[PDB]
Structures are given as C-alpha cells and as structure tokens.
Amino acid sequence: GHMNNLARLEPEVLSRHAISSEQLGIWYIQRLEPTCSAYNMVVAFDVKVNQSLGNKPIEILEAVMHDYPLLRVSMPANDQGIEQLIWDRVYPNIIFSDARHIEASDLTQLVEQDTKQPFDLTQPPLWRIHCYECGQNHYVIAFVIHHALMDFWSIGLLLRDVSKRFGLVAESDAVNGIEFVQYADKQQSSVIDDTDESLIFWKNALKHAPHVHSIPLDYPRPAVQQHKGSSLVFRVSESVSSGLVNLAKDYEITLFGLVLSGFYVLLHKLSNENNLVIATPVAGRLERSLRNALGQFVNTIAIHMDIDADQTLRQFTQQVQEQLRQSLKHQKIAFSRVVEAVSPKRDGSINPLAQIGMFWERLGGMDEFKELLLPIQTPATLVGQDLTLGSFPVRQQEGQLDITLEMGGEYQGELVGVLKYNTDLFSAQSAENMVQLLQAVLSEMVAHPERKIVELDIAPDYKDGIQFEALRGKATDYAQHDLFAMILKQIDERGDNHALTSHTVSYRELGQHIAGIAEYLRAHGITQGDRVGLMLDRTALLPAAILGIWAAGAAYVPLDPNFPTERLQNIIEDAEPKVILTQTELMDGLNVSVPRLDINQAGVVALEQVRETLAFGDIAYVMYTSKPKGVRIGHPSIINFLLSMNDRLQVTTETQLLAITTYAFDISILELLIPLMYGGVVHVCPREVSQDGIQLVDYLNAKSINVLQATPATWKMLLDSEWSGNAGLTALCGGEALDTILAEKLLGKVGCLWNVYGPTETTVWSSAARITDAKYIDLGEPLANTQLYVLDEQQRLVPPGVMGELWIGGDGLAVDYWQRPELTDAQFRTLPSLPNAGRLYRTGDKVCLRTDGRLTHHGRLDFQVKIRGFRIELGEIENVLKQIDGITDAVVLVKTTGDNDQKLVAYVTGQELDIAGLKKNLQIHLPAYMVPSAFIRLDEFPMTANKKLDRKAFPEPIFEQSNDYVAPRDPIEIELCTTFEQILSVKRVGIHDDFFELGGHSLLAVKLVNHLKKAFGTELSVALLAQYSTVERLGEIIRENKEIKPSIVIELRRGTYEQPLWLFHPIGGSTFCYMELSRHLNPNRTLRAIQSPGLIEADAAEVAIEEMATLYIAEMQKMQPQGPYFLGGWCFGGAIAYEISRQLRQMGQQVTGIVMIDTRAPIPENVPEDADDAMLLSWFARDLAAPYGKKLTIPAQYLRELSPDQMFDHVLKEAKAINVLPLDADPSDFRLYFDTYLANGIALQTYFPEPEDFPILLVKAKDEQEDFGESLGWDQLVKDTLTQVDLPGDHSSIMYAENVVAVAQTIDQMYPIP
Ligand SMILES: CCCCCCCCCCCCCC(=O)OC[C@H](COP(=O)(O)OCC[N+](C)(C)C)OC(=O)CCCCCCCCCCCCC
C-alpha cells in the first residue's frame, strides 16, 4: 500500500534443486521448532534521505531480485527429501510502519520483536524488509534473512552491491547469485562413505565427548529447546586488547586461537570439568570460485578439548591451536554428517554434541561498513548523493545454543564482543558474571603467561575477606550472655504461670525440679565436667532434666530409649558417662556396666536452698552423629544460637511451641528451651502423637500452638493428613533440603516459614531463610557471629556462579569431637587462605555461590551426581515426579551398573500408580538425559531416627539390560513398523525400538514424517517424531486422532521388478502374518498386502467374497492397471486370491500364479461347525493370539455364564493382558475387529466356486494335526495346474520366523525374478 507500484501476478517454478548439507541443519531446526527466530539474520540502518532519491528503492529492489535467483528461493519438503525451488518471481514482503510517536528505547524493542517473526521456509520469500518512519525523510530499515538461505559473508556481498546501486560506495565486485545451486547439486552426487578419513577423524575426536556440559544453570533445563535468548555487549580494555595481540605473536597462535583458549579455561573454571566441547563455525569457501557467491556455506565444527590443569597457559594455548589446525583439515565434513556418524542420544533439550559456541567473524573488503556493522552505536555514517546510512543496533540471532561468544570487531582500541545466552538457563546477572570472568581470564593470560591452569585464580579479589557482605553475620556479644540467669529470671517473674505441658508444670514448679535434679546428681557423685547419660520418655521432666544436669555443671549425652540397643551401647562405650539418668520403667532396659539413677527418686528442692551451688559448666552436651562421633558443644555456642534465633522469632509470653523432635537431635534444643527464656509455654509432645498425622492434627487444633519446628518428613506427614492450617503459626523446616513443592503447600498453610540449616558441629542451625515464595529457596542469611565461605579443593574462595565446599566460621563452632583429636584437627582448622577468619569447620556439603549472593545447597561432595560425563540435579527430577497425580513422594538416586557405568533410579510412593505411565510422563517433561532408567514403587520411604530420608537404605535396583522385542498389535503399529523397517533398513522392528537408536537421523526423520502424512491422511511434525520416537509411543499419538483414514493397501516392500505380489488378509482381516514372510522374500520384488476396510470403519467389512474381490481388484488396478497379476494369501487369503483370479479372467487380465499357504479349499466339507455367539468369541480369542505364537484360551462355557457385553469386555481385557492388542484399545475398536472376523466367516460360509484351473502353488503345513485331506480339498477344484509342497509347521506356525523362511524360498524358486 506504501508499494502499489508492484502488483502481485502469480508465480511459476523455474527449476528444482537439492539443498546443501550446510543448509539441512538450519532447515531442520526451523521445522522442528516453527516459532524459532534464532536464525533470523538482521542488518539494520538509520536512513536519512534527500528528495532526489525518488523511486530508486523500488527500482533497485526489482533489479536485485531479478539478478540474484537465490532471492526467489523456497525450501519445501516431500517424501524423497528437501528441495530448493527457484521461482520466476516473488512478491516482496516489505512491511512499513509509522514510528514517529515512539521513544528510542521502544523503537529498538519494536524492531527486535518485528524481525523475530518466524519464517516458513517452504513459502517464499525467505527474507523481509521492515521499514519505520521516524520523522520527515528519516527512516529505520531492517533487513531480515533466514540463515538457511544465506550466511553473513553473503550479506556483505549483497550489502556492498546494493550500496553501490544506491550511490554509497564507488565500486563492488560482481556477485554470483546462481552458483549455490551447482554447489548443492554436485554435493548430492558425492558419497562420503563411512570409511572417509575426515569422517573417521571426527568420529574419534568426539567419541569421548560428554552428552552435555556441566555448567551450573540458574533454572532447570526445559524438556524441549525453545530458542529464547538474549545478548550482552562488552568491551575488552585497550590495555588487555593490545596484550592479547602481542601475546598471540609471542606464540605460534592466532588471536582467534588465543581467545578460544581463554574460553575453554573459563568453562573449565565454571564447571570444574576437564572434557569440554565448543562449536566453531567456519566460512566454508575454500574454492576461490565461491568467494563471490551468495549462499549458505558456513559449517559448524565441534572442538572437544581434554583440559589438563597441569598445563601452563602457554602450553595449553598451543595445544588448542594445534587441535584447531588439525580440525580445519577435515572441515569439509558437514556437522549434520558428523552427528549422523557419532550418533549421540537425541535429546530435544540440547543441540547435539555441542551446546557452547564461539564465532569470530571479520569480513574483508568492507572497510566503509566496519563501524556500521558493530553491535554498538557509532556516530559514523555513509553519505551518498541521495541518502545517508547510520548505525541502528538490533539484538539478533538469539538462542541458537546455550552460550555463544561472538568476537572479531574492534573500536577505539578495544575488542568488541557479544555474549549470547539462553534465558531459560541463565539469568542476566549470570551473563554479566560470565563476561566479567572472561575479562579476568584474558587479563590473567597477558599478565602471567607461564602460570599453570590450576594455579590460576579467576575469582574477584574479595575486599574484607569474604565473598559477599551478606555471608557475614551480625557481630554481637551474644556468646558472652548467661542462659541460666535468663531462665531463672523467667522463673522468678512468671511465678505460677504455665511453663511445661506433658499434667501441667508451672514456672515455680519447674525451678523446683531444676533444683531437685541438680541436688540429686550432686548428692550421688556428679561433679562439674561430668558426662551424664540421659535416657527419658517425652514427659515434662525432659526440659527439667536438661537444665538440672546443666545446673550441676555437667553435660548430657542423649540416649533416646526408642533407638536400637546396639546404637545406644556404642554411644555408652565411646562417651564413657559417669551415670545414666533414666526413669523407673527403664532401669533394667539395657545391660550396661554403668551406674543408673532414677529421676523419679530425685527430691524436689526449693531453688533458694541450692542456687549458690548451681552454675553451668563449660560443655553443654555431647551429641552423637553418624563409628560414633560425639560432638561436644559449649554453652557460649548455644546461647549465641538461641539469642540469634530470637531475633527472627521474637518469642514472648504468649508463645506456645510444640516440641516434637527427639532430644537426641540437636535441633530439639531450640524447641525445649527458647520459650522458657521468655516466659512462654513448651508443649512436650508425646512421641506416639508426633508420628501419627491425624493424632498430630488433633493435638495442634487443641493446644493452640504458634511455633512448630520439624523436618520435611513430619511436614509431609501433616499435609498428607488433611491438616487445616494455622495462619498464626510460625513454621521452621530443617535437616533436609526444602523442595519447591513442599514449600508451596506450606506457604498456604502457615503464617511464616523459615528454611533453616546447619551441621551439628556448628550448633543446631547456622543459616536461616525467610521463605516467601516457593520459586526462591536458598540457605538464607547467616546467624549472629557466623561466617559462610565457599571453597574449592585447594581452599580458595570460589568465583560467583561456581560450586564448592561450604566452610563455616564464628561462635557456633563445637569444642571438638569427643576424644578424637586427629579428626577434630582435620575438620576444625584455620586456613592460610583466610588468615583473618579464625577457626573454621569443614561441612562436606556441596554449595553454589550464586551470582545473586545467595547460597544454594546441592549437598554432600561424597555423592556421585556424575553420570556419563556430566552432572545431574536430582531434585529437578524429584519435583517433576511429585507433580503427577497419585505420586506422594519421590527420591532419585544414581547407581552403578555392570562396568564403570551409572544410571538413574526413581523410587516412588502413592495411593495409585502406573509405572510405564511414569516413564511416559517424565519423557515429555524432562530432558532425555534426566529420565530415569528404573522405577520402583515403595510403600514407605525408609527414615533415619532423626526423621530424615535414609538414602543408603533404599533397596538396590535391578536394571533392565535390554528392551524386549514386541510385535506390532494393530493396523497402526503394523504400518509404522513396516515404515521404520523399510526407511532404516532394519530387518525386524519391535514397537519399543527407538527410531534414532536404530540408526535413524535428522534427514531420515523428515523423510519418514512426510511418508506418514501420506499414509495416514494427517499432518505430523518432526517434532512429534522426536518426542514420540518408538512405534508404540507414536502409535498412541496417531490412535488418538479418530479422523485418520489409512489405505487398505500396505506396501511391505518396494522392489525393482515390474510385477508385485499381492497378498490378501485371512479371516481376521489383518496383514500382520505377512510381515515375517516379507523379511525373507527376495527384496527385488514389490510386495503389497490388503487389510479389510472393516478394521478401520464400522460395518465396512464385506460379507461376500465375490464383492470383496471386486472391491480389492479396483484398489489393485489403481497401482497396477494391467496384468499379468501375481496373487496369494495365507489361509482364507488364498481363497480371496482364487476369487480375484476368477474375476480377472472375466475381464481379460491374465494371472501369473497364485500362492496359497495352507489354504483350505472353498468346499462344503471344509466349512467350520456351527457356532453360537460364545463359541465365536472363543474362536476369535484363539485366532487373535495365534499369529503371535500365543494361546489364548477363553472357553465357550465360561463366556456363556456372562452377558454379551461382559463377554466382549472379558475377551478384550484378556487379549490386552497378553499384549496382542494395545492397552489403549477401547471396546468399539474391539467391535471393528470382531465384526471383521465375523464378516469373513460368513463370507467363507457362503463361497462355493465351480472348478477352474489357475497356475497354483499350494504350500501345506505338514505338521498340522487337523485333517483336511492330502490337498486341503483343492483336488476337487483344480485338476492339472496345481503344484504342492509340504513344509514344516502347522496351520499357524508355517508363518513364524523358524518355518516361514522355507516358505519364502519356495515362492522365490517357483516364481523366479531376474
Ligand atoms: C534482502 C535484499 C533486498 C535488497 C533490496 C534493495 C533495497 C531496496 C529498498 C527497499 C525499500 C522499499 C520500500 C519502500 O518503498 O519504502 C518507502 C520509504 C518512503 O516512501 P514513501 O513515504 O511511500 O514515499 C512516497 C513518495 N512519493 C509518493 C512521492 C512517490 O522509502 C525508503 O525508506 C527507502 C530507503 C532505502 C534504503 C536503502 C539502504 C541501502 C543498503 C541496503 C543493503 C541491504 C542488503 C542486505
């Protein structure tokens, strides 16, 4: 409309060509994900014009389109592959918008969103021009060209030429816009045999490559790649930029080589992996003939480096330059051909073989355009008589890979780069971080050339000896406070108010018990520093026992009496306690050589009589943890902890806390004490109540609780017990990781949620996160006088975004491990690399220092998250499983198998589950590499005594080592199997064989899908095949569409001989029985088989053989109009063939011969006995299973006891139970098959042809028990022209693999073909 002067008159195709291998990969990706814009190349300009421009843009447009045939190309697909068509003319797609009213920021965004509109590569043109008016005579013009059509080198050729036509540059080399076709067509003649030296090179270079890199992501990887990306432009300082150039000269290497080396070093530091792959596009125009040619010539190569951290940067840089040099020798091999040869596991979440890229592009002979083509704004212009070009930067080609580094440009001394990153994996903050780290590697390279890759520290120099200021907790005097005095004050003040709920104990009464228990212990030998075993039931005496023991100056050792006796004995022996303080009932419980004291015998004593006596000792307790380790905790740590916790909890008089945690778990310390410090109430929860969800829901609703701390296990128990929630309740969750699912459930049930963390060695908790949103979970903020550090294996502070060991410093630290000084000395140290951080504790926990400043937990360095060369985030798998309806919990582990091989196992619990159903679900929701190899149902996940998941105690999995051959079960699976077989050249394909594992690859998938579209009458995508890639899975998808219309002809083999062999269905109406036969027939003979229409449309089965034959003959004459004909059938198929022959004579066609395999002649003697409906079903059930070598025996007598509907359900259910029908077959499906069966029966029952001679081969199953005569009765129909051959097998088994080979041979020897 801004462009009336064109008119659309309708185009014709000039010529048809092949696409190149360099085009195939891009093309494929665009079909695979049609909303993809990642390959939309965009060059854009500010354009200011003078009036003398006139009509030149349209005139020049028309001239260019005419001169360069490439610009008139489309790339449609057929079943023989992918083509390029040159159209005689294309209507240009030129969009023109008013942008006078739009702010600059917004205008950029507009143009970015406009140019990302996707192309359909099958419909021309494959390029667009987007125009925007910005003011009078002032425009922005953006040219968009899909990379499947041409590369950037081509852009420059085109840019320079069109600029000359416009009067902007003085001269331009001639451009060839027709050579791309010759190139592609010649390439189609070439072979590239599996024996090619270049192909072998790549096959070896990438054999040990990991499936995926192990760079920590900010988000979980989506199951199917969406090609969303973003871009971060950076600049290298002029200092370093110069250094790099000089450092390049100080080696053999190129500048490209140097920066690539820097990039590997970077990814090595970020992932701590030695095996890294980086993709690098090459220009691809080695022949001088191709320098001026438009087209897509760029080829990806994958460089897999094995990093040796011991190498110096000099040495390693040289190592890369050399592997680069060798690799460029073999660059002729297309990336798609390399992926075909290496044959990695196809996975829709990642680009195959490489997910990291580096492009280094500098065009030559484009000096005038240098600054215009940079990714930054520049005031430089190109001024012509009629117009003026200026910069206009546009984000473009985003989301090709996980990460792409783009370099090559320079401005005012500084190298200019663009880091492109996938925004479903990385945050903007992480991109910024990667750039800052690259900056660092490059700097450290020029400054210290000889430094070893391990010795190299990329980390920022941290200012006040910490990674983030958040990681240092508030400095306070809390550790110098007096816990006892605080509690005494509350006793003196709170008086007769409640303190403990078992009957209720007042604060005054509590003080009396403290005193009486302290005096009991003193009076019986307990002195300051002694260790006192504590073996109690959860009563109100429990808090009092703790404080009593403390007041006598002793430390307690928790001996929870519900724990197993062997465990308690091991503690007794290591701790060597002075006495065991227990209760009456338990005095004889353990046979131990240690004095016992009954706490009930302790008097009650007025506090005023023994307060002069009472004072805490140095050590508060020895808490045992998994050989037994006793962690000795001092009272300064405890009070530091408690006070720190109070800042967050603000405990008051109205506080009512439900204590549920065993006192043999240190976290119980918080539950049993902190309300007593402030005048509130401790509800000591009986153990039987806290292990029963319904009983705990009732205790909660009753006692008006407002603080509850518990491990996830307990919280899960509560939510799974229909708990109503409390909006005034403050919840604490600790001991194990908090998953997002539990978090959201909790957030809607409680008023405040803390995720809280810390090893026993740094006193209960050490960090704490106020969780407000389930999407944002971390270890949170450090407590008072606590410092968190994330270290590597050399104990240096890691860079942000990197994983390491969490070390903890400050006032929380334990005194030691009880009488284990060497262990104590190794786990509690000061470090030279942190000389001001004091004593620190080594947690053995794996933690990530986020770019955010947050810490996330991945914990326990000792566990192998490492699989086939990469690492897994097990919890992401666990989250997807928990989101299934039915599933209640899930745990995923890595286990070892056979050789040095690792596999994933998923354990699940729930009220109602389907295991195969799980596999299917995760496959569509997870990246392929995160889908478990085994699924095990459990009733109850094994717990520890602390109430944590006991991962060591899950039963070991027994992995399937192979997948069972299963034959296709209905017409849909028969058609897919034959199609898989035929297209892959695999003899026999089972419904669980994977297309790509069987040797299939991306081009084949395009061919396959285009065939399936024709065969079924519907639209399928390569996306559907990628994700449903077994016959079973794809068959379920196709089966869902009730509007599919299969042909009744299935082509089992396309041969090279003129005459096909036609095969006709037996009684059941299906072609299944000819598949195995077809595998052994001479492959040069076309074979076609005909199923009954009855199998696809209701009531469509013919009931008269005469009518059946006419119908089929018409179907035959569409593919083979004239004879001679060649016909055959197994069983009843033979009889159809006979009648078809009889009719072909009548119309003058000749019959070459008939193949009849154990066909009972159509004569009265051979008609089956009369059957009632039950018997017919019983027969049908049997004849359903026999083609698969299975007996299915449903006695007629059993069926007669049921209603007719029950009958059909019973047979359907049974047939499924032995896998001769699909599980998703419904009763109506079953009616089609039974009705077809009945129809053929009636047809048989009414067919009695007069004798007629045809040339016949009758193959008789010689082991068939049932007597039908020497010739199955054919001696009464055929006189002179019948040849008989007796072969092993019975009426069914003659067609099974073992016996059917001899049948094929007989057919081939009787009816030879040249
Ligand atoms: C993919 C390869 C294709 C190569 C084709 C060559 C480029 C041809 C430019 C096509 C743009 C034509 C669209 C167009 O008509 O734009 C309209 C504007 C304003 O026109 P309008 O306001 O309609 O003027 C009417 C004047 N009247 C009534 C008195 C006749 O007029 C303009 O804004 C014209 C701006 C021209 C910018 C030329 C820039 C040259 C470098 C291009 C290099 C790109 C190759 C990669």
Ligand SMILES: [K+]
């Ligand atoms: K620019």
